[PDB]
C-alpha cells in the first residue's frame, strides 16, 4: 500500500546484508591504541620531534 | 524564588506520600501534614512551628529570624512554654496578633496545640 506524495528512493537491502556486518565496536579502543603507539614512538625517538 | 521552587518540590520529594489516595506532605514545619503552599515554612520568610518537647512538658516553639536565607541551623531559635492551655494559647495568639508575625494560620495552630496537649495528657 504505497502512500501519498513524497520522496522516492532505491533501498539497497535486497541482498543478504546480515552476512556482511561491520559496525564500529572499537572506536575508543582504536583511539587508545593509536595514542599508545604515538606515545611509544615519541619515547622511541628522544631528540626528534613528533612531526619529524 | 518563592513560587518557583514549590513546583519542583511538589513533583518529587522524600516526605510526600502516595498511597491509598492520600497525597500529603510530612514536613516537620508543615502543620497538620497537609500539602499546600500556605502550609509551609521552609520557603517563606516567616515560619511558625508548633511541636511538642522531648519530655511531656508543654510546647516548643521554633521561631525564624529575618537573617535566615541560607541558614539551616542558626536561623531558627527554640523556646519552651510549660504552662496551662489557656495562657499558652493566649500567648500564641498574642505572638500572632501583636507582634505581627505570620497572621495567617490562627485556628489551625489552636487546634494543633489542643491536639498536642491532648496527646501529651497522661493516659487513664
Amino acid at each position: 500500500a504505497p502512500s501519498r506524495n513524497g520522496m522516492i528512493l532505491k533501498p539497497h537491502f535486497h541482498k543478504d546484508w546480515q552476512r556482511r556486518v561491520a559496525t564500529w565496536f572499537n572506536q575508543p579502543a582504536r583511539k587508545i591504541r593509536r595514542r599508545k603507539a604515538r606515545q611509544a614512538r615519541a619515547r622511541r625517538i628522544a631528540p626528534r620531534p613528533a612531526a619529524g | 524564588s518563592a513560587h518557583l521552587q514549590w513546583m519542583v518540590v511538589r513533583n518529587c520529594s522524600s516526605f510526600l506520600i502516595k498511597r491509598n489516595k492520600q497525597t500529603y506532605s510530612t514536613e516537620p514545619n508543615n502543620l497538620k501534614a497537609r500539602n499546600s503552599f500556605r502550609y509551609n515554612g521552609l520557603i517563606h520568610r516567616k515560619t511558625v512551628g508548633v511541636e511538642p518537647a522531648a519530655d511531656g512538658k508543654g510546647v516548643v516553639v521554633v521561631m525564624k529570624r529575618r537573617s535566615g536565607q541560607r541558614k539551616p541551623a542558626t536561623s531558627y531559635v527554640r523556646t519552651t512554654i510549660n504552662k496551662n492551655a489557656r495562657a499558652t494559647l493566649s500567648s500564641i495568639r498574642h505572638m500572632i496578633r501583636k507582634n505581627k508575625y505570620h497572621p495567617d494560620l490562627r485556628m489551625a495552630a489552636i487546634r494543633r496545640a489542643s491536639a498536642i496537649l491532648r496527646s501529651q495528657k497522661p493516659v487513664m
Binding site: - | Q5, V9, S13, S14, L42, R70, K71, P72, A73, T74
Partner: protein
C-alpha cells in the same frame, strides 16, 4: 536548600556556608585526619546514614 531536604541529607549540621574549606584539605593523607575534619565540620550524620 529545600532540594537537599527533599533528597534526604542532614542539612542541620552545617550552620551557614555553601561549604568552601581552605586549601590545606588536599594536604591531609590520613583517614583519621579525614574523620577528624568531618567531626570538626560536624558533617558525620550524612555518612552515618
Amino acid at each position: 536548600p529545600a532540594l537537599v531536604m527533599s533528597k534526604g541529607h542532614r542539612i542541620e549540621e552545617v550552620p551557614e556556608l555553601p561549604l568552601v574549606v581552605e586549601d590545606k584539605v588536599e594536604g591531609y593523607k590520613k583517614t583519621k585526619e579525614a574523620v577528624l575534619l568531618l567531626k570538626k565540620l560536624k558533617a558525620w550524620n550524612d555518612i552515618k546514614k
